[PDB]
Amino acid sequence: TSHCRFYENKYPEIDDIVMVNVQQIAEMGAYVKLLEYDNIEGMILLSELSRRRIRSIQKLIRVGKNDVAVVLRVDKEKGYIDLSKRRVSSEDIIKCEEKYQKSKTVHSILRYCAEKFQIPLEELYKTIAWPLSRKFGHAYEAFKLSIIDETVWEGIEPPSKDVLDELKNYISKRLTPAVKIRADVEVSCFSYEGIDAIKDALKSAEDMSTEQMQVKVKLVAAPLYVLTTQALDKQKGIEQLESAIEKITEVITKYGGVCNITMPPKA
Amino acid sequence: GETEEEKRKREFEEGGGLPEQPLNPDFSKLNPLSAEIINRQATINIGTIGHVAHGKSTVVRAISGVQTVRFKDELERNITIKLGYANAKIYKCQEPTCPEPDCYRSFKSDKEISPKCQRPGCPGRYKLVRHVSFVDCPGHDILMSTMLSGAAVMDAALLLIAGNESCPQPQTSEHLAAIEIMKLKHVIILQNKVDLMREESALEHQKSILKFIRGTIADGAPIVPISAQLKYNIDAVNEFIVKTIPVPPRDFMISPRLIVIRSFDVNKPGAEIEDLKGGVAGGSILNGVFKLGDEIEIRPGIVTKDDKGKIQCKPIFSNIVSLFAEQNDLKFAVPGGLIGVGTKVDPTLCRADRLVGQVVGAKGHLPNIYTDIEINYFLLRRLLGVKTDGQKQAKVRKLEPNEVLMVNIGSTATGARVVAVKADMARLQLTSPACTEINEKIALSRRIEKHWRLIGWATIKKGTTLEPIA
RNA sequence: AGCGCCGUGGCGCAGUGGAAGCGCGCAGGGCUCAUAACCCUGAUGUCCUCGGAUCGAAACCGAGCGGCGCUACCA
Ligand SMILES: Nc1nc2c(ncn2[C@@H]2O[C@H](COP(=O)(O)OP(=O)(O)CP(=O)(O)O)[C@@H](O)[C@H]2O)c(=O)[nH]1
Ligand SMILES: [Mg+2]
């Protein structure tokens, strides 16, 4: 029971960019289904099909696959779509490819949710997806902040709480990303004692490791020491590793040696 | 049904094993071949000289069994910049009945004091006459400072000549003259190829090799047919080493010193740095006993350049953590060989070719850094290493002011500029710091055919000193 | 030794969260009197092993097979 379109209104809009699964081709193109809005079909017309000249009709369509699309005039009376494929900007295709995949994942999760709860998708998107899209602009960003922050479900009225529990479990299992921020610090020392200073630096860099983020400067060479961190929020590893670099500098400036940075902390 | 490893173990136990060195032995009575010294350290440094693509590490491997790394991907096959090493022990059979030529046998350092005799029929046991270290030298025409530094290290020579090739190899003559330069006279001639060459070609190559070495300084150099892969005529090599080559006078009456040629950063990748090791400099001790626990400094060390362009030389004091030699960590170091001194020197300092040709001294001495040096130099008449196709081997020219010359003071590789040229004396300005200890036999090379070419010898007579900054 | 990279249908690229991919190859057919150009359909996958969650994984991850780029021979 797959239904319940991705965005606010059932019908396409003015100059909107979508994507289409194609099934059938009669004479003037293909009146074929959508999977960005409900499940309605639309005309792709041959004069407005491809950039090159239309040499073949079978190759460029690829029945049963995903394709770019733009709607010109929406038949907001009965459910018809006039649709285009040629006039989508090269930068526009890829950004819609995002929007489309963005929309698809939320449905992929809430499908599993409905099929396991046998509640029609319409009610689930009504109760959950639409308030999330209203609050955060995208249900995908709402899901990501749900992984981080629990307060995303406050102000929402699920049809049942077990839906929330299983959705949270499935999102923590499937939508799990902890980005590895890594850096390299070059020891350019020529000084008196360097290995004791390095041990002190490693201890002072490793005792700082928190419960959630643990920093281990691993060895791959003498000058080049590698700093690996698991940034849970993609914004704390930077400050951790900057503090680490400051502490390395505090170490090196007085024993006699010198060190330099080769790569700073990067995601 | 005893496994081979347990068999080697019972052999090691029956051989006496490797006893630990005494912590503080009476150093007045310790001769270089004492059991406390020779069972766990090499005392004579033997180097292999020869033309490229002749096989020098293979010969030492057939003698000893220890491989010479041959690292750096590209250098896995062509030529190696840094010196290759192998430990060898000379075990002589105690039984008189077995023939003398096969009594000698060269074994790995991992062997024990008294290993069993492998000849079929001889129950007797071997006696370790001496441990010998092998300082392999690059044999190429571009890498020239490395072989001169190795010659500064080594104490006995093995010359390598191919049989089926041309007799008058120029690289071998260059090596022989270079060894002749620094008061070293014990060279043994070794014919690499004997299997693939005939009986009368054997006499012809013998005669050619004899005719080559008639006017040089070395006159009584033995010749031996050897094979690097057949693993034969190894015992006679050890015999010649034992008989012809004595120990030069070296005792503990002299002040301690060090000459580092290789750098080694002990930094095991992947493991936690909470368990890490120090920095190891590979150095020869030409004079002075060394022990576990010392304060030692390299003299040129940190070479910095200020905003005014003057060169500042910071000596690098370091507390030695260990003195690795042979196979086991030792408690006393026997001078006259390369020992890996592992100290608190920063690991990055021992990473690259940074500790290549640098003098080091223990606390209680003050070697002097010099920036302008007065040398007394002598030249040969013809260049060595050039293959002129039948015309008057390149004649050596007289020196010119303001030219870059590679002036290898012992192990140091310096590009000096000439200030004044006399008939026998000269002055050199060194942007790369050099130091003076006593006399420091020097080698000289220049640039005409691109790569460096040896010309003659030099000895320091005077210089301008730069006080190390505390 | 470790850090980044990767895993053909013959090949190079691509998506990999819903199950077999493109283009070039090879086979066959079409157009032409006839060839190349062009147009159609194919026959080829343990998309590298052991596992996992999941109605789903070549694909998302991990205890490893294989080969590169990098530090680089680390006594
Ligand atoms: N037929 C034969 N080949 C030999 C003999 N000795 C060495 N070789 C070959 O020489 C080749 C080079 O070996 P290698 O020892 O690495 O050369 P090298 O002496 O290190 C190069 P350089 O002299 O410049 O230092 C090897 O392939 C080896 O098989 C020999 O006695 N007979
Ligand atoms: Mg070599």
Asked whether A35 and A60 are in contact (CB, 8 A), the reply is no
| B55 and B195 belong to one structural domain | yes
Domain ranges, residue B383: 367-462
Residue B342 near chain A (CB below 8 Å): no
The CATH number of the structural domain formed by A179-261 is 3.30.70.1130
Calpha distance B424→B375 (Å, rounded): 9
User: Cα separations (Å) of A244 from A66, A215, A230, B154, B393?
Assistant: 48, 9, 14, 47, 63
What six digits make up the tokens of A138? 């995208």
Tell me the β-bridge partners of B104. Answer: B92
Q: End of a domain among B225, B250, B275? A: B250
- The structural domain count of chain B equals 3
Q: Which residues of B touch A199 (CB under 8 A)?
A: 273-274, 276
Ligand 2 ion: nearby residues, β-carbon < 5 Å:
B 80, 84
Nearest CA among A68, A69, A72, A79 for reference residue A15: A72
B159 and B64 both lie in a single domain: yes
**In this structure, what CATH number is given to the domain that contains residue B387?**
2.40.30.10
Domain ranges of chain A: 16-91, 92-172, 179-261
Best residue in A191, A202, A215 to probe B by mutation, most B CBs within 10 Å?
A: A191
Domain stops at, among B366, B393, B413:
B366
B277 and B212 in a single domain? The answer is no
Ligand 1 lining (C-beta closer than 6 Å): B 50, 52-58, 79, 138-140, 192-193, 196, 227-229
| B377 and B387 share one domain | yes
The contacts found for A75-83 with CB under 8 angstroms, 24 or more apart, are A75/A11, A76/A11, A79/A11, A79/A40, A80/A40, A80/A42, A80/A43, A81/A12, A81/A34, A81/A40, A81/A41, A81/A42, A81/A43, A82/A42, A82/A43, A82/A45, A83/A18, A83/A20, A83/A42, A83/A43, A83/A44
**Domain-terminating residue out of B341, B366, B391:** B366
B310/B400 same-domain check: no
Name the token pair of B454: 């040896």
Considering the domain architecture, whether residues B220 and B324 belong to the same structural domain is answered as no
Interface contact B270-A218, CB threshold 8 A: yes
Give the residue from B347, B192, B185 showing the smallest Cα distance to B265.
B347
Residues 145-184 of chain A in contact with strand C via CB under 7 angstroms: 170, 173-174, 176, 180, 182
C-alpha angle B131-B133-B138 in degrees, rounded to nearest 5: 160
Residues 6+ apart with CB under 8 A from B308: none
Q: Note the strand C nucleotides within 7 A of protein beta carbons.
A: 1-4, 16-18, 23, 38-41, 53-57, 60, 71-75
> Which residue CA neighbors atom 1 of ligand 1 most closely?
B193
Evaluate whether residue B13 is within a structural domain. no
Measured from the Cβ of residue B469, the count of other Cβ atoms closer than 10 Å reads: 10
Q: Does B383 lie in the same domain as B286?
A: no
The reply to whether B433 and B391 lie within a common domain is: yes
B56 is in an annotated binding site: yes
Locus of tokens 């004396």: B425
Q: Which of A184, A188, A195 to mutate to test the interface with B (most CBs of B within 10 A)?
A: A195
Tokens of B390: 């039948």
First to last CA, chain B: 66
Method: cryo-EM
- Please tell me whether residues B294 and B326 are part of one structural domain: yes
B401, B336 in Cβ contact below 8 A? Answer: no
| Domain co-membership, B412 together with B436 | yes
Is B234 inside a domain boundary?
yes
Return the best residue to mutate from B49, B51, B58 for the ligand 1 pocket (most ligand atoms within 8 A of CB): B58
Q: Where are the alpha helices (DSSP H) in chain A?
A: 90-117, 121-124, 130-136, 139-148, 161-174, 195-206, 237-255
Co-location of B149 and B114 in the same domain = yes
Task: Please indicate, yes or no, if residue B377 is contained in any of the structural domains.
Answer: yes
Residue B65: CATH number of its domain: 3.40.50.300
Domain A92-172 homologous superfamily, CATH? Translation initiation factor 2; subunit 1; domain 2 (1.10.150.190)
Residues B344 and B212 in one domain: no
Residue B17 in domain: no
Q: Which residues from B are below 8 Å from A219, CB to CB?
A: 267-273, 276
Class of domain A16-91: mainly beta
Which is nearest to B426 in space by CA: B462, B361, B366, B375? B375
B57: which residues sit within 8 A by CB, 6+ positions away?
B48, B67, B68, B70, B84, B86, B136
**Which resolution in angstroms does this entry have?**
3.8
Q: Which ligand is nearest to the CA of B136?
A: 2
Cross-chain residue pair B279–A195, CB shorter than 8 Å = yes
- Residue A67, helix vs strand vs coil: strand
Distance in angstroms (rounded) separating the CA atoms of residues A105 and B2: 66
DSSP letters, B59-114, are: HHHHHT-------SGGGGTS--SSPPEEEEEEEEE--SSS-STTTEEEE-TTS-SS
Distance CA A262, CA A186 (A): 6
Contact by Cβ (8 Å): B412, B441: no
